[PDB]
Design a protein around this ligand. Structure first.
Ligand SMILES: [Zn+2]
Length: 7
């Protein structure tokens, strides 16, 4: 799967 971290 694709992953996004919005810190
Ligand atoms: Zn993945």
């Amino acid at each position: 799967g694709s992953n996004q971290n919005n810190f």
